Amino acid sequence: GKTFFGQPLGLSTLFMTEMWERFSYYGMRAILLYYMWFLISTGDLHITRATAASIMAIYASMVYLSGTIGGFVADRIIGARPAVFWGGVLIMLGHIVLALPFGASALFGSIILIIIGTGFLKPNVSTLVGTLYDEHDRRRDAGFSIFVFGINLGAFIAPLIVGAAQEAAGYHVAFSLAAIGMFIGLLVYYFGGKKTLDPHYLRPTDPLAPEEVKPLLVKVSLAVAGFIAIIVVMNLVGWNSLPAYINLLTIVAIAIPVFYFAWMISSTSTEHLRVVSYIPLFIAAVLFWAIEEQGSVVLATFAAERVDSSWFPVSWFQSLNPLFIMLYTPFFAWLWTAWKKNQPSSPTKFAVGLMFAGLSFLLMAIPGALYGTSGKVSPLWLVGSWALVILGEMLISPVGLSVTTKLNSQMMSMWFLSSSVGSALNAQLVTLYNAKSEVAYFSYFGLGSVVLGIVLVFLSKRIQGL
Numbered sequence: 001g002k003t004f005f006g007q008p009l010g011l012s013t014l015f016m017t018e019m020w021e022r023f024s025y026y027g028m029r030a031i032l033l034y035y036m037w038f039l040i041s042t043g044d045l046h047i048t049r050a051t052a053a054s055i056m057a058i059y060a061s062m063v064y065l066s067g068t069i070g071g072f073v074a075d076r077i078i079g080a081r082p083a084v085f086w087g088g089v090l091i092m093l094g095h096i097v098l099a100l101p102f103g104a105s106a107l108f109g110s111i112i113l114i115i116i117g118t119g120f121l122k123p124n125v126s127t128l129v130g131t132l133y134d135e136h137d138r139r140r141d142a143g144f145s146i147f148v149f150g151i152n153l154g155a156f157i158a159p160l161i162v163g164a165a166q167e168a169a170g171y172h173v174a175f176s177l178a179a180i181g182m183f184i185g186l187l188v189y190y191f192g193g194k195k196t197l198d199p200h201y202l203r204p205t206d207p208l209a210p211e212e213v214k215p216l217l218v219k220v221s222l223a224v225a226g227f228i229a230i231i232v233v234m235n236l237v238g239w240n241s242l243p244a245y246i247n248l249l250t251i252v253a254i255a256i257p258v259f260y261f262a263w264m265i266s267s268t269s270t271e272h273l274r275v276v277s278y279i280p281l282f283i284a285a286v287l288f289w290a291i292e293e294q295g296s297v298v299l300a301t302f303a304a305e306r307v308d309s310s311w312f313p314v315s316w317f318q319s320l321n322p323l324f325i326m327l328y329t330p331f332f333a334w335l336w337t338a339w340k341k342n343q344p345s346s347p348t349k350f351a352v353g354l355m356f357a358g359l360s361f362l363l364m365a366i367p368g369a370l371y372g373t374s375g376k377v378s379p380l381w382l383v384g385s386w387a388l389v390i391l392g393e394m395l396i397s398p399v400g401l402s403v404t405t406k407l408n409s410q411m412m413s414m415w416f417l418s419s420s421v422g423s424a425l426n427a428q429l430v431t432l433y434n435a436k437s438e439v440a441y442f443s444y445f446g447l448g449s450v451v452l453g454i455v456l457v458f459l460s461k462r463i464q465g466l
C-alpha cells in the first residue's frame, strides 16, 4: 500500500534521522577549521594552523574508530534504539557546547561529546534499517540505497545553510544551527520510532550473560589503565604538547589494525593466504580514504586561501563531495548491472579507484605550477578535484565491505577502520601542506598514489584467485 519509495514506512523515520544527524556533522565540519583559524587570529587559541588541520584529521579518525564500537555496546548492553537516542543527545550537546559564548576552551568537550555520540548513533541507525526487513526480502538493497541518499542529502545542504549562517550571524549561531539539526533529528526519531520500530530493539539483542560481565569489566579497565599510564609517562618525560597527544592518537589508530593483522597472520593455511592478500587492498583503502578525508582540511585550506570566492561562503565547497556522490550513484548503479560480461574484479576496482584519487591531487598541482602560488585561481580546479576523487569512491566503497567479507568479525571491522587509519595518516601529512609546499605536496602524494594504484593492478590477478 502506502510505502516510502517502495519500502516500509519506517524507513522514512530513519532516513530523516540520519539526514539531520549528518546535517549536524557536516555543517560543523564545514566551518570548524575556519573557526579554529579565527580563534588563532584573535590569540584565543595558541596553536599553529598546521596543528588546527591536524586536529581536524585526528578528529575524523576518532569518529570512525568510535563507530566500530557502538554496535557492540548497543547489541550487548543498551539496545539499538537507546543508542541512537542518547548518541543523538550527545551529538546535540557537542554542538550546543560550541554555541555557548565560550571559545577555545570548549573545543575539547565538544569533540569528545561528538566522538562518543556519533559512535553510538552511526552504526546503530544502520542496524535499525536492516531490522525493517525480513531477511529474505529483496527490497533490502534498495532501502539502504535510499537511506544512503538521505545521508548524502544532509551532507549536501549542511554546508550551504550552516556556512551562510556563519557569514550572516557568526560562528556561535552557525553552530547552534547544527545543534538544531540534530534536535530535529531526535524529534523525528523519537516519535516516528515509537510508531514504526520493533520494541525488541529497545533492549540489547545479545545481552551479557552473568559470567560475561566480569571479564568485560576487566578488559575495559586494563585498556583504560594502560592508556592513562601511557599519558602519565608521556608527561613525565615532557611529551605533553598537543602535537604529542595527536601523535599518540595516531599511533593507537594505526596499531589497532596492525595488531589485528599480526594476530591473524600468526594464528587454514589457504585461509591464511587470503588474509595476506588483503593487506594490499587494505593499504589501498587507507590511502584512498586519506586523500578523500583531506577534502575537509587541505582542500578547505586551498578553497579559503587560493580560490577567488569573494562572492560566496568558501565553506560551500564542502558540498561538492556529497553532490558528486549523489550525481554519480544512480549512474554506477545502472553501470554494474549493464556491465555483466567482463566486470572488473573488486581488487581491480580498488586499484583504479586509488588512481583516480591520485589524479585528483595531481590535478591540483597544476594551477600552482602554471600560475604560481601567490595569486588566486578558478573555483573549477576544486570542482574537478572532487569530481575525480568521488569517481574514485564509486569504485572502492560499494565493493569495499564486500571484498573484505568474502576474504572474521575483526576483519569486518577492519574495512570500517581503513577510514580511521587514513585520517590518522592525514593527521601527520596535512601539517606538511602550506603555500610554499603546495605544488610538491599535491604532486608527490598524487603521483605516489597513482603508482601504488599501478602496483595493485599488477597484483590484481593473484588476489582474484584467492
Ligand SMILES: CCCCCCC/C=C\CCCCCC(=O)OC[C@@H](O)CO
Pocket (backbone or CB within 6 Å): 055, 058, 059, 062, 065, 066, 069, 104, 107, 108, 111, 112, 115, 242, 249
Ligand atoms: C575508542 C573510542 C574513541 C577513543 C578516542 C579518544 C578521544 C580522545 C581525544 C579526542 C581527540 C581530541 C584531539 C583534538 C584536541 O585536542 O583539541 C583540543 C584543543 O583545541 C585544546 O587546545
Ligand SMILES: CCCCCCC/C=C\CCCCCC(=O)OC[C@@H](O)CO
Pocket (backbone or CB within 6 Å): 081, 082, 083, 085, 186, 187, 190, 193, 194, 202
Ligand atoms: C531533547 C530530545 C528531544 C526528543 C523528544 C523528547 C523525548 C522525551 C523524553 C526524553 C527523556 C527520555 C527519552 C526516551 C529514551 O530514553 O529513548 C527513546 C528511544 O530509546 C527510542 O524510543
Ligand SMILES: CCCCCCC/C=C\CCCCCC(=O)OC[C@@H](O)CO
Pocket (backbone or CB within 6 Å): 092, 096, 099, 100, 101, 169, 170, 172, 173, 176, 179, 180, 183
Ligand atoms: C533542547 C535543546 C536543543 C536546542 C538547540 C540549542 C541551540 C539554540 C540556540 C542557541 C543560541 C546561541 C547563539 C547566541 C549567541 O551567543 O550569538 C553570538 C553572538 O553574540 C555573536 O553574533
Ligand SMILES: CCCCCCC/C=C\CCCCCC(=O)OC[C@@H](O)CO
Pocket (backbone or CB within 6 Å): 069, 072, 073, 077, 207, 208, 209, 210, 213, 216, 217, 220
Ligand atoms: C569493545 C567493547 C567496549 C564496551 C564498553 C562497555 C562498558 C564497560 C563495562 C560495562 C559493563 C556493563 C554491564 C551490563 C549489565 O548490566 O549486564 C548485566 C547482566 O546482563 C548480567 O546478567
Ligand SMILES: CCCCCCC/C=C\CCCCCC(=O)OC[C@@H](O)CO
Pocket (backbone or CB within 6 Å): 230, 234, 238, 239, 240, 241, 243, 244, 245, 247, 248, 251, 252, 255, 256, 259
Ligand atoms: C593497541 C594499542 C597500542 C598502542 C601502542 C602504545 C603507544 C606507545 C607510545 C606512544 C608514544 C607517545 C606519542 C609520541 C610522542 O609523544 O611524540 C611527540 C613528541 O615527541 C613531540 O613533543
Ligand SMILES: CCCCCCC/C=C\CCCCCC(=O)OC[C@@H](O)CO
Pocket (backbone or CB within 6 Å): 316, 317, 319, 320, 323, 378, 379, 380, 383
Ligand atoms: C550546484 C551545487 C551547488 C553547491 C555546490 C558547491 C558550490 C561551491 C562552489 C562552486 C563554484 C564554482 C562555479 C564556477 C564559477 O563560478 O565560474 C568561475 C567564476 O569565478 C567566474 O566568475
Ligand SMILES: CCCCCCC/C=C\CCCCCC(=O)OC[C@@H](O)CO
Pocket (backbone or CB within 6 Å): 366
Ligand atoms: C567527459 C570526461 C571529461 C574528462 C576530462 C579529462 C581532464 C582533462 C584535462 C584536465 C587538465 C586540466 C586542464 C588544464 C587547464 O585547463 O589549464 C589552463 C586553464 O587555466 C585555462 O587557461
Ligand SMILES: CCCCCCC/C=C\CCCCCC(=O)OC[C@@H](O)CO
Pocket (backbone or CB within 6 Å): 359, 362, 363, 365, 366, 368, 369, 439, 443
Ligand atoms: C584524467 C583527468 C586528468 C588528470 C590530471 C593529471 C595531471 C597530470 C600531471 C600534473 C602534475 C603537475 C606537476 C607540475 C610540477 O610538478 O611542477 C613543479 C615545478 O616545476 C613547478 O612548481
Ligand SMILES: CCCCCCC/C=C\CCCCCC(=O)OC[C@@H](O)CO
Pocket (backbone or CB within 6 Å): 369
Ligand atoms: C598514460 C599516457 C600518458 C602519456 C604521458 C602523459 C604525461 C602527462 C603529464 C606529464 C607531467 C608534466 C611535466 C611535469 C612538469 O611540468 O614539471 C617538470 C619539469 O618542469 C622539471 O621539474
Ligand SMILES: CCCCCCC/C=C\CCCCCC(=O)OC[C@@H](O)CO
Pocket (backbone or CB within 6 Å): 366, 369, 370
Ligand atoms: C592528461 C591530460 C591533461 C594534461 C595534464 C598535463 C599537465 C602537466 C603539467 C602542466 C604544468 C605546466 C607548467 C609547469 C611548468 O613548466 O612550470 C615549471 C617551470 O616550467 C616554470 O618555471
Ligand SMILES: CCCCCCC/C=C\CCCCCC(=O)OC[C@@H](O)CO
Pocket (backbone or CB within 6 Å): 363, 378, 380, 381, 384, 385, 387, 388, 391
Ligand atoms: C567518467 C567521466 C567523469 C567526468 C569527470 C569530468 C571532470 C574530471 C576532471 C576535470 C578536471 C578539470 C579541471 C581543471 C579546469 O577545469 O580548469 C579550471 C579553469 O581554468 C577553468 O576556467
Ligand SMILES: CCCCCCC/C=C\CCCCCC(=O)OC[C@@H](O)CO
Pocket (backbone or CB within 6 Å): 283, 432, 437, 440, 441, 444, 445
Ligand atoms: C604505504 C602506506 C603509507 C604511505 C605514507 C607514508 C608517509 C609518506 C611520506 C612522508 C613524508 C612526505 C614527503 C614530503 C612531502 O611530500 O611534503 C611536501 C614537501 O615539499 C614538504 O616537506
Ligand SMILES: CCCCCCC/C=C\CCCCCC(=O)OC[C@@H](O)CO
Pocket (backbone or CB within 6 Å): 457, 458, 460, 461
Ligand atoms: C607515459 C608512460 C607510461 C605509459 C602508459 C601506459 C602504461 C600501461 C600499462 C603499463 C604496463 C602494465 C602491464 C599490464 C599488466 O600486466 O597488468 C594488467 C593486469 O590486468 C594483468 O597483469
